[PDB]
From a paper:
In contrast, nonprimate-associated staphylococcal species, including S. pseudintermedius and S. schleiferi, utilize the MEP pathway for isoprenoid biosynthesis. S. schleiferi DXR is a physiologic dimer with each monomer related by crystallographic symmetry. The monomer consists of three regions: an N-terminal α/β-domain with a central 7-stranded β-sheet (β1-β7) and 7 α-helices that serves as the nucleotide binding site; a middle region of the protein that includes a second β-sheet (β8-β11) and 4 α-helices (α8 and α12-α14); and a C-terminal α-helical domain (α9-α11 and α15-α18) that locks FSM into the active site.
To establish the structural basis of FSM action, we solved the three-dimensional structures of S. schleiferi DXR as an apoenzyme and a FSM complex to 2.15 Å and 2.89 Å resolution, respectively. A DALI search identified multiple DXR from Escherichia coli, Plasmodium falciparum, M. tuberculosis, and other microbes (Z-scores: 49–51; r.m.s.d. ~1.6 Å2 for 370–400 Cα-atoms; 39–40% amino acid sequence identity). Of note, the staphylococcal DXR enzyme appears somewhat distinct from previously characterized orthologs, particularly in the α10-α11 loop sequence, which could be explored with additional SAR studies.
Residue numbers in the entry:
A (entry chain A): 1 to 374
B (entry chain B): 1 to 192, 199 to 374
The structure:
């Protein structure tokens, strides 16, 4: 019976993680969690799971929870109180943005294994986080589909025997379009009404392939890979999630339909597996699987993520921050779709690279590109 | 540094294993081996490799070898002395037929890991072999693409968390032929040693592999599945109880499994062209058609029934393939001969090793 902490429990992944806990009261206990401003959700979680400590973003909201619980904290410190809570066995960091960076580091220092649902953490601070995890002897477990897949291919294997790792990609919303059709695509072409659904930024990143770019960067640090060991391939059906070729030329692959709960539960159970009630993949129904060569002239954003790996240092911090700014301009109809990549490329070209930047320089650089004039 | 024993070193498989050893002198050591009448080859191997003990089939060829002497034994007992040699680390059973059955059981009782280069051992006697190996904490690796795939999917995993295991199959040389077209198949058509070739066209080979997997991974019959996969790139899949699916992929190949068996559970470098999924472009999957591939269905019947039934399956298939090769019966008569002998068999529930040998000898030697 292991104690789970959830940072950012009211977001989409946090809620799926709570469902996993609810579906296995025999194996998991929610010992601690945080929310931003969704106090009603914190209330329902407290009554159902009786965590031992809970954090909110605003000091002002602590009084709302006092009638329900004896130990409420708030603010930037409250994330640390929760992430370093001494009864935690595993800390799921499903915070979005740079905010989850500090709490992860302090959790590692306290000796807690981390489940990362936060893509920024290893994109902007991959070296920093992984060296810290190795020094303190904790595991960084992915709860993302491609990294979960790679993680399962390497279970029981010696990392030194890896020849290379291939991440699959759908091709995104616009995969069917000609490169010239891409000169005329509108945000409407990617999203019918932005306010209907969640995941708008993520849809854009998948259409530009920045999403796969970020996953290449994370994989490089998560599994301590050389840059020329990390490959991609276009895979229309997204049934095969990743492949690993070993030095004997044997290739392991992880396959599945897209249930986002499976990697969450795997992170909670690793190295065990427990039952998950869900339909099984049926390859006879799938019938065919397609593969074709990644085209980096078309998906230039993925090319930029490899550039940020080659250059290293603070360059992936710039890539992530400017991508966030550019996708938001795109969503609010200020720039064309192809202007996303020119904006990123222009900012990358002018950036003066910093070392090996520290945690506070990473935050500085992140804030600068988010808030500068364009 | 691993001490390798080879039973049946004279055949192609034996020769392949010796190549593996010769190419990795830092990894392996040919410590003991077995030959059955090719004394010439056995001298060469003694010349090159420093074997400590050798067995020959005839008590009569023992003299020709003691000038070249390593310690030499012979006959049925010789196999057991090689198989259970104390310095053995892992024994490659490449004996063709029933003669490999008792040497492996006593190797298991001596605490030795087994590589099986023939499907007979676990088809006729999977129950017995696995029970022993379980009691003695011993690895059992069939030198086979599909089983090497499954073993790799299980790296770092719990066999108890298996939901399903799926074996893939191309469909064989006649996959694009209709059951009506099979009426006019010929030996020449089908040859494109020789018995193993027919078993692939007929799908008996995947049938045998289904039977081995059941016992190897201690699976219930509904947990062992097959699919038709034309490109033979995915070699097997394992679904776990969380519904995650692991698969092993590659170009179809045979140099890799012996080497895999020798290094298991380690991997070492192998120089061959890498799988290129961009060039393959497409992977196809279809439901397995048991009315087209009746030999596969017979394998499953033998599992459901259990006991001596798989012994009969294997024996009659060998007789039938050989009579097809000698042009006494049609390609389709293979499946009919198997069916009838199966339908008439009176099954023995938990046969001893001795009863397995009698049943196999009976169906091999009776007239039809």
């Amino acid at each position: 019976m292991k104690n789970i902490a959830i940072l950012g429990a009211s977001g989409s992944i946090g809620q799926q993680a709570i469902d996993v806990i609810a579906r296995h009261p025999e194996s998991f206990n929610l010992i601690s969690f945080t929310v931003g401003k969704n106090i009603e959700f914190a209330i329902e979680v407290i009554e159902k799971f009786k965590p031992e400590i809970v954090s909110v973003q605003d000091e002002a909201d602590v009084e709302r929870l006092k009638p329900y619980h004896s130990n409420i904290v708030s603010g930037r410190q409250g994330l640390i109180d929760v992430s370093t809570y001494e009864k935690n066995d595993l800390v799921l960091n499903a915070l979005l943005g740079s905010v989850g960076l500090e709490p992860t580091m302090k959790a590692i220092e306290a000796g807690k294994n981390i489940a990362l649902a936060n893509k920024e953490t290893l994109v902007v601070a991959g070296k920093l986080v992984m060296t810290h995890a190795k020094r303190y002897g904790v595991d960084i477990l992915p709860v993302d589909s491609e990294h979960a897949a790679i993680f399962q291919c390497l279970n029981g294997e010696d990392m030194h025997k890896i020849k290379n790792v291939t991440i699959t990609a759908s091709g995104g919303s616009f995969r069917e379009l000609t490169r010239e059709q891409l000169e005329h695509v509108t945000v409407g072409d990617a999203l019918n009404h932005p306010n209907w659904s969640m995941g708008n930024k993520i849809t854009i990143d998948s259409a530009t392939m920045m999403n796969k770019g970020f996953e290449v960067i994370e994989a490089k640090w998560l599994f301590d890979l050389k840059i020329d060991q990390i490959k991609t391939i276009l895979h229309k059906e997204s049934i095969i999630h990743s492949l690993v070729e070993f030095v004997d030329t044997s290739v392991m692959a992880q396959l599945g339909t897209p249930d986002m709960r499976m990697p969450i539960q795997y992170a909670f159970t690793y190295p065990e597996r427990i039952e998950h009630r869900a339909p099984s993949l049926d390859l006879v129904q799938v019938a065919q699987l397609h593969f074709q060569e990644m085209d980096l002239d078309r998906y230039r954003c993925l090319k930029f993520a490899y550039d940020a790996l080659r250059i290293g240092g603070s360059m992936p911090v710039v890539l992530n921050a400017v991508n966030e700014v550019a996708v938001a301009k795109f969503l609010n109809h200020e720039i064309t779709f192809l202007e996303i990549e020119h904006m990123i490329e222009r900012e990358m070209s002018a950036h003066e690279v910093i070392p090996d930047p520290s945690l506070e320089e990473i935050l500085e650089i992140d804030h600068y590109y988010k808030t500068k004039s364009y």
